[PDB]
Symmetry: D2
Subunit: 251 residues, 4 copies
C-alpha cells in the first residue's frame, strides 16, 4: 500500500486539480511531498492538513530562481530528490482561432508550460544525475490535435513537452533516470489562466459536459498514472506518454 515509501517528490501546480490529487495520493503512499505552486492559501492549507511529510513552497515555474530555490530547499530538507513532477499548466482564451491568438498570450502559455517544464527538468536533472536515480514527469496531452478543445498555444506547449520528455529520456537514461509524461486528453479542472476570464471560460466548458465527480475521477486517474510511473514498479518505463483519456483520442 506504500508504493512510494521513503521517496521524495516535488509536484508543481500542486495546489489544485491533478497536482493536488497527486500530492494527496503520493502522501498516502509514503512519499515526502513538496507542493510547489503560486496559490499560497490553497497550497499551504493542503500541506497543513496532510502533516509533517508535506510542505508548501511558493514557486513560479517560469522563474528560474524560484525553481532553484524549490529544488535546493527540497534536497536540503530531505537529502535527495526522487521524483520531479512538472505539472503546472495555464491556458489562454479557450476555443479561439489561430487568427486571434496574441503574441503576449502565446508567450505567457509557453513560459509557464514549456519553459517552466524545461527549467524544472534542468534543475531536477542537476540533482538526479549524481544520484544515478530519479524520475522526471510532465503533464502533457494526447498527441492528436487537441487545440479545438483547448487552444493552439496550449496544444503547442504540450507537444513541446512531449518532445522534451523524449529527448531527456534519451539523455538521462544512461544515468539511471526515467522521463515520462502523464496526460489527460486536454484541459482539466484546476488549470490556470493567462487571465481570470480564461479560467471562467474553462470552468463553464467542463461543467457543461461533466459531473464534478467526473472531473475528480479524470484527475485521480492521471494521479494514479503518475503513482505507477514514479514507483519502482515502473523502473524500466521511460520515454512514454501515458495518456489517460478513456481512448477518446484514437478515433
Amino acid at each position: 500500500s506504500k508504493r512510494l515509501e521513503g521517496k521524495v517528490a516535488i509536484i508543481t501546480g500542486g495546489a489544485s486539480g491533478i497536482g493536488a490529487s497527486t500530492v494527496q495520493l503520493f502522501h498516502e503512499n509514503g512519499a515526502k511531498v513538496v507542493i510547489a505552486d503560486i496559490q499560497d492559501d490553497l497550497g499551504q492549507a493542503i500541506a497543513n492538513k496532510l502533516g509533517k511529510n508535506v510542505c508548501y513552497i511558493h514557486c513560479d515555474v517560469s522563474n528560474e530562481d524560484d525553481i532553484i530555490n524549490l529544488v535546493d530547499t527540497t534536497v536540503a530538507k530531505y537529502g535527495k530528490l526522487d521524483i520531479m513532477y512538472n505539472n503546472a499548466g495555464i491556458i489562454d482564451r479557450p476555443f479561439g482561432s489561430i487568427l486571434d491568438t496574441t503574441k503576449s498570450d502565446l508567450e505567457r502559455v509557453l513560459g509557464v508550460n514549456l519553459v517552466g517544464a524545461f527549467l524544472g527538468a534542468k534543475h531536477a536533472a542537476r540533482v538526479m544525475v549524481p544520484q544515478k536515480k530519479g524520475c522526471i514527469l510532465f503533464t502533457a496531452s494526447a498527441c492528436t490535435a487537441i487545440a479545438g478543445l483547448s487552444t493552439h498555444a496550449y496544444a503547442v506547449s504540450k507537444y513541446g513537452i512531449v518532445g522534451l520528455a523524449k529527448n531527456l529520456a534519451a539523455e538521462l537514461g544512461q544515468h539511471g533516470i526515467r522521463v515520462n509524461c502523464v496526460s489527460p486528453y486536454g484541459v482539466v479542472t484546476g488549470i490556470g489562466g493567462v487571465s481570470e476570464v480564461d479560467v471562467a471560460v474553462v470552468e463553464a466548458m467542463l461543467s457543461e459536459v461533466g459531473n464534478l465527480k467526473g472531473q475528480i475521477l479524470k484527475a485521480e486517474g492521471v494521479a494514479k498514472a503518475a503513482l505507477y510511473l514514479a514507483s519502482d514498479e515502473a523502473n524500466y518505463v521511460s520515454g512514454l506518454n501515458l495518456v489517460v483519456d478513456g481512448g477518446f483520442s484514437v478515433v
Copy 2:
C-alpha cells in the same frame, strides 16, 4: 496489496516468460487466473503450485475452437471475465533478412501472434460487452523498427497487434471495455519458435548480452505494467501501447 481482488484473468502464453510472471503477480494480487498455453507440463505445474484460484487450460491460440473452449470454461467456472491478456508469441529465424523469410514461417508467426490475438480478443469481447466491463491486453513491441533484433515476421505481427488494440479500443470503449498493449522492446525469454532451432538462437542472443536476473526483471517489468493496466487504477486508460524498454527505442 490486492490490486486485483476478485477479478478473473486469462493469460495466454502463461506457462513461461512474461506470461508466467504475470500469472504469478496477478495471483499474488488476488485475481483468479486461467493459464492458457500449449506447454502442459510447465503450465500445470504452475497451476498446482499456486493453488485453487489458478488453473491451467491447454489452448493453441491460433485454433478458434481452443479459444472458445478457453473463454467459455473460464466464464463457466467464475461467472465472468475481467481481463484477457493475449500474450502468447513465437518467432521464426532471428536476425534473418527479408530475402530469406519463407512464406510458411511468416504464416506461422502471423497465425499464432496476430490471428491468435485477434481470436482471443473476439471471444473475450463476446463476453465483456454484456458485462459493460473488461480489459483486453496484448503483448506487443516498441513502434520503432525492431526487426533487426527480432525478425520481419515478428515485427509485422506486433505492429498488426498495435493496430488491433487501437481499433478495438475505439469500438469497445462505448461498452466500458479498455484495450491496451504492454510491450517489451522486442524479444524476451520464454518466446516460442516456429522451430526449436529458433528458440535456441533466441536463447543465445539473450544470454550474450544479459544476466538471467536481467531477463527476469524485464519480464517482471512488463508484468507489473499489465498489473497496473488491468487494475481499477487504470479505469480510464485505453488505446495505449505501454512500452517497457528503459527508453531504448526513443534514440
Copy 3:
C-alpha cells in the same frame, strides 16, 4: 514532365482504383509499367490502350509463385526493377463488429493484403539489393483507428503493412533502397472483396457521401504521391507513411 523516364515499375492491383490511376500516371511520366492484377479483362484492356511500354501480368499476390513470375518476367523484359508498388488490397464485410469477424475472412484479408505485400517486397528486394537502387511502395492507411470506416481485418492488415515498410526501410537503406507507404484514409473505390457482397457494400458507402469525380480525385492524389516518392525527387525519402486524406485523421 517525364519524372520517371526510363524507370521500370510494377504495380499490383493495377487494373482498377488507385493502382490503375498510378499505372496511367507512371506511363504518362515515362516509366515502363507492369500491371499486376487478377482482373484480366480490365488489366489487359489498360495495357492495350496504353501501348508497348505497358504490359499486363496475371498475379495473385498471395501466391508466391505468381509473385516470382511477376518479378522475374519484368526483369527479363526490362533488365531491372526500379519501383515495386504493392498496392493490391481487399476487404471483408465493411463496418462489422469484432464479434462477427470470421477467422476465414480475417485470414483472406491478411493473405492478400499483408502476406501479399510481404512477398512482393521480398522478391523485389531480391532484385533491388544487387542494383543498390530501388523504391518499394505499399498502399497503407492512416494510423488512427480506421476500422469503423473499413473493418478490423482491413485495419490490422494496413497497420502490419506500415510496420513492414518501417522495418524494410531500416534493413534496405544500407543497400540504397527506399521503402515508403502511400495511403488514402481508408477504403477507396476499386478495392476488392472477400465476397462480391463485400464489394457491393463498399460501393454503396462511397457513393452515399461522394461524387464519382471525388473518388477519382482521391485515387489520383494517392497516385501523385506515389509518383513523387518513386521519382528521383524523393531520393532521400524513406520510412514515410505519406497519408493523403485532406487532414481527416488528425482531429
Copy 4:
C-alpha cells in the same frame, strides 16, 4: 515543368540553406517568390540574380510587426498568398547537456523557431482563410529524439512546430487550407545561431561527416519535398510531417 505556375510563395530563412534552395526551385517552377530573412546581403543578392518575380524583404520572424509587413507587402504586390513556408530556424550550443542550457538561449531558440513559426502561420492564415485556398509549411525535424545531434532547445522547438502544424491542419482544413511540415533529420547547413560560435560548432560537425555536395543534396531534397507539398499535386495532403532523412530515424 512549371509545377507552381502563378503561385505566390513566401519563404522565411530564404537567404541560405534549405530556404535558399527552395527559393530557387520555386522560382524555376513558375512561382512568384518573396525571400524573407535577416541576412540582407545574401538575400538581396539572390533576389537580384533571379529577377523580377523574386524580391527580398527583411523580416525577423520573432517580431510580429515584421511578419505583418512581410505578409501585407506580398499580398499588396501580388494580390494573393498561396504558400507560406515558415522555414527560418536557429540553434543554441550544439550537443550540450540539459544541465547547461541557459534560459536565455532556450527563449531565443523558441522565439525564432516556435513563436516565429506561430506568427507567420497566424498572419498567413489571416489572408488564406478568405481565399479558401492556401498551403502553410514548416521546417521541422524527425520525431525521434534528435537533441543528441542538435540541442534540447532546438528539438523542443521543432516538436512544438509539429504540434502546431497538426492543430492548424485541423482548424484550417474546413477553409480549404493545407498545413504540413517538411523536415530534414535535424541540423542542416544554413541554420542560424544564438551566437556565431554556435554557427561555428554547427559548421564543424557537418563537414566532419559530410561532403559539401551532400549537404547541398539534403537541402535540395527538403526543397523538392516542399515543392511537391506546395503544388496542386498535393491538394489533398495535410497534417503530414514529410521527413527527408534517408530513413535514418526509424532504426
